[PDB]
């Protein structure tokens, strides 16, 4: 919330919530944070094709 949450991004995996955070007064990079149904949270590549697929299937 007050610094960057994502240093690295997921390689090759499988849903629930996806927060698209634009750079702000505390972080300089775009962070795509996915909250799963499983409860777990993940960092995803904003330019990734699997990402653009999920944010749309939800929309």
């Amino acid at each position, epitope marked *: 919330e*007050l*610094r*960057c*949450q*994502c*240093l*690295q*991004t*997921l*390689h090759g995996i499988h849903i629930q919530s996806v927060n698209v955070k634009a750079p702000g007064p*505390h*972080c*300089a*990079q775009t962070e795509v*944070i996915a909250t799963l149904k499983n409860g*777990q*949270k*993940a*960092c*995803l590549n904003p330019a990734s094709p699997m990402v653009k697929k999920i944010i749309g299937k939800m929309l």
Partner: antibody
Amino acid sequence: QVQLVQSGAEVKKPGASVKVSCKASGYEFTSYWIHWVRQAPGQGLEWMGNISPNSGSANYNEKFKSRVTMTRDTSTSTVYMELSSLRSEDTAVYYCAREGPYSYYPSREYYGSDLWGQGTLVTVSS
Amino acid sequence: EIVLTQSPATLSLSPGERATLSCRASQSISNNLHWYQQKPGQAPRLLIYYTSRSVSGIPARFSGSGSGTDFTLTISSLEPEDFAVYYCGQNNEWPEVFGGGTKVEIKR
């Protein structure tokens, strides 16, 4: 060997620029954030900013934003700190430090800066 | 921005004694408060991370505790190599902020 090796001491003239390097060794370069923290003679520690060794996305202290630029070279596993418009007040020992490891899993709980370089003295004098 | 206040500025003790160091945050920094040691001519060395967690290579005599806005570093029994400067550093938000330091001096 798990190391952070920095460039040598620098003597710079007021108004000039300095570029300090930090070479990562014996670990996953991509897994740790790299910070730049300076210490003026006889003073405390001041954070200048950091860089993501993957993206090269850098974050800066607003006090140094306008004069500082951090960059990385993945091929050499090195990070750089460039400070511009040097003043007497910039005479300090500049340290690079790593914070992590971190993956694609975000957390509300952070590690500390567990590994520091040997430091780089930068002297601003005519 | 965050202001970490270290107390006291100087701590005068003898080897074998217990050392207790304070760090007070201006506002909540959750538990993202870390402790570092600094010897003359050397880089700061991390002792305790995330208020109370252990660090590889750090002796058992070192421990930390805290209550969200107030933190403590405890050195159980002082060894000669423990006389140095100690900083507390927050990394909950950016910019990272450090306290003024506490010098642990030999008492005489």
